[PDB]
């Protein structure tokens, strides 16, 4: 019934711009409904944040045991949802899991190979490891003009890291989405309103943004990476 | 364009996956419905669907949108065998290029059916005259590389419009384009026989003689993952200008 | 309040002969003459419900100038009686053509399940001052067959039509009914006529029970057509 | 296998309400008598004779639908001019008939006759075997309101007088019907203006007298036409 495929998409659109991060969770949840069965028993979410993915998880899947992880419990049955709080690279994973899901969080990790060792041991055989992260061009306009940002993995780094850690890969995709704001100030407004973020430096930042001024506006790039994976066989 | 808190966007995607080859049409009607949830209001009084067919898109339309009056169109009258009679659903059976469109429509929707139209610019004129001001035109269709494997090996297919032929025809018909995209999917089957079985199982479709050389001809499309079959869906969310 | 039309009541009765096989056509001729009285000779858009073989259809085109003629019936197999625009299907489940000058129907509305709300679509599809003119059948139609076999249809009467037409927003310019009894030579001739017009001991009993419908001229068979000429107000 | 052309006996009754142009009443009686002629008579007729043609409203309907080879018109006066159109002017009860007729036709004229039984003797001898005698006249309820409010009016035959007289003269009756029509004018003056437009001190009481005929829809004027399709033996 299943058939391997390669795909490539492109188009021009309009976005509410304040919605960008929740729609990434919506796209990841579509991939979960595709591959994973409706019913699962034990699930572990890393970096749950405000809970945009968790509410999509519970309303689309039937899970009995749910473990939520983040540095803070800002998500506001109940004995079925338990709280593991702290840096996930410091904590011991819940065991015998059907699925580990993460959304927009793995880019903050310092030692991903070691963390994927914890993913392997905690998961059952053919247990699901599904996550969304970001590639090297995510918010690269801010990286060039301010010298700040994360060093991201690309698709080949993830591929050779999951295979070397003993994971079979079912889905591995990436996307580059350029938003075009009217002026460089609206770019900063979007970053504050979505929570990502001298007077000399401010307008000097607005001067150099002309290097990113296209016919439609000043560009801001999001580079989400999507992956669906299974353990061992 | 001059509207605030909406931002223009350009995107590109690529990846490798495992699909259920029989679910392709459901995948496209699901993708189009996901676009309808983004751009369109949750309630619509009058909606018109061209080429309802089995009803894959119709199922997704009624569960996500409160519709007061739903009008369904298709070529065959026995399309009404795949549906149960409801008071708020009317029918317009026949070739849609020969039928008067229902009046005062909030949205005209159609999934993987406009590629069978003979006169597309004349149909877009009817869409414009049937929609309310700022009425919705949202459709799925197919691009030029659609099933190019079957076009080359059998010499049969369709004439497909590309994005900027659509972009040009919609703008001059009076439509503003809010969303316009396309994707290319190559499915890798294990053998050319699975390609033919897939084409008949999903309802797209000589013997042993020509059936054997067609298998050897398909060797030109064999990747390391299997034998390719290309799908080229086109999506478009438009509004009456 | 028109200064040339005048309110009218009439009643007629008499004895005659009839070619028993042309009843359906004769019913159409009576409706066609009522159309000639009230209606303009030119109408751009006309919608005919239940055209059938086209008895009333050809009488419409012969005496009126129509630009858009839409013909409806249940079965597409009646287009083989013509050659217009075609609207095949159950009229109660069909999207009406809009901005109509007249909606015509001959001996077909007695088959409808929900007449009050089909009139609502007759109201919306018609222009201001649009015409609604039809012939149907009354409660005593084929009552000899319903009394003997228990089979038949529930027919509205005039007062039901006068009530539902004004409740839906229609004026009434003509509302009449006729009862006609044809006296066949024998009950066998009644069955022969019923199958020619397209409508062992159970058979002999039927011939016996029909003697209760014996008159001086023959055996009875009642037709009860209703004629109406309405207009949207 | 075989065609179907079986005449059957029939008794009918009609009733309803309507609107109509008051100036159009004789033209409609002519239109109704022409409908009966089309239902009983062949399209081809060699010799036709009309009694009381008058304005010619029935004559235009006759030649419109039937193929006549010789047409003789009769009336007290004379209102195409082909060579096969003859005129017989004068009191028809003092004139010898044209012989070997296929049909004798008359519209709204036989009510003025002084000796109908004698005139039926002439109709018999002039008609061929199975030759048609068709006419429209009026019954005793015709203009009954003007009859009692002025004490003036003609003496009319009823249906039984005609049925007995035709059978006595040697005629067979294939159709015999009567109709009562009550027109409702806004006021008795419009009744008089109708009586003066259609060729038919003490005034205020004649209006006061007319209140005896006041319905809810207006003041009544009654027409009582009689139709009969006969053929000679
Ligand atoms: C961009 S938010 C994601 C919010 C959204 N609900 C989702 O899941 O996609 C990423 C979250 O990961 C959390 N996070 C980052 N590093 C972490 C770590 N080392 N251990 C646990 N949580 C971490 C942060 O607190 C942040 O809330
Ligand atoms: C691929 S099917 C789409 C079925 C289903 N709605 C879906 O997309 O999953 C395309 C449909 O378009 C209809 N169609 C083709 N030509 C048409 C025409 N000229 N007018 C109306 N419908 C047409 C066909 O009947 C066929 O069922
Ligand atoms: C007695 S025939 C009339 C035929 C004749 N040509 C005429 O119109 O006077 C009635 C017709 O109505 C059609 N009919 C019955 N129910 C219908 C419905 N619900 N919707 C549309 N047509 C219907 C039937 O197919 C049938 O041909
Ligand atoms: C009231 S008109 C009806 C005319 C109408 N156009 C029609 O024929 O249907 C009857 C006609 O009969 C004529 N008529 C009356 N008495 C007649 C008589 N004795 N001989 C010949 N014509 C007579 C009158 O002159 C009158 O024109």
UniProtKB/TrEMBL annotation, chain A:
UniProt-listed Enzyme Commission number(s): 2.1.1.197
CDD domains, per database record: AdoMet_MTases
Signal peptide: none
Ligand binding (S-adenosyl-L-methionine 2): 70, 87-88, 104
Catalytic activity: malonyl-[ACP] + S-adenosyl-L-methionine = malonyl-[ACP] methyl ester + S-adenosyl-L-homocysteine
Pathway(s): Cofactor biosynthesis; biotin biosynthesis
Keywords carried by this UniProt record: Biotin biosynthesis, Methyltransferase, S-adenosyl-L-methionine, Transferase
GO biological process, one term: biotin biosynthetic process
PANTHER family assigned: ARGININE-HYDROXYLASE NDUFAF5, MITOCHONDRIAL (PTHR13090:SF1)
HAMAP family listed in its UniProt record: BioC (MF_00835)
Family: Belongs to the methyltransferase superfamily.
Annotated protein name in UniProt: Malonyl-[acyl-carrier protein] O-methyltransferase
Species annotation: Acinetobacter baumannii
Annotated gene: bioC
């Amino acid at each position: 019934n299943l058939v391997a495929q390669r795909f490539a998409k492109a188009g021009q659109s309009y976005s509410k711009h304040a919605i960008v991060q929740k729609q990434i969770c919506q796209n990841l949840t579509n991939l979960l409904k595709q591959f994973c069965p409706s019913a699962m028993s034990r699930v572990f979410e890393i970096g749950c944040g405000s809970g945009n993915l968790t509410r999509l998880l519970v309303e689309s899947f039937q899970i009995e045991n749910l473990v939520l992880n983040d540095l803070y419990a800002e998500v506001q049955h109940e004995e079925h949802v338990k709280w593991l709080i702290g840096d996930v690279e410091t904590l011991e994973f819940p065991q015998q899991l059907d699925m580990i899901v993460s959304g927009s969080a793995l880019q903050w990790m310092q030692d991903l190979p070691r963390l994927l060792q914890h993913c392997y041991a905690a998961l059952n055989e053919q247990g699901w490891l599904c996550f969304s992260t970001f590639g090297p061009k995510n918010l690269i306009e801010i990286k060039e003009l301010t010298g700040q940002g994360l060093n991201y993995w690309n698709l080949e780094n993830w591929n050779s890291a999951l295979t070397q850690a003993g994971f079979e890969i079912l889905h591995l995709a990436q996307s580059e989405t350029q938003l075009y704001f009217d002026s460089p100030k609206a770019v900063l407004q979007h970053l504050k309103a979505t929570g990502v973020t001298t007077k000399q430096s401010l307008q000097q930042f607005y001067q150099d943004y002309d290097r990113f001024k296209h016919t439609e506006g000043y560009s801001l790039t999001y580079h989400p990476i999507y992956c669906i994976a299974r353990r061992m066989k």
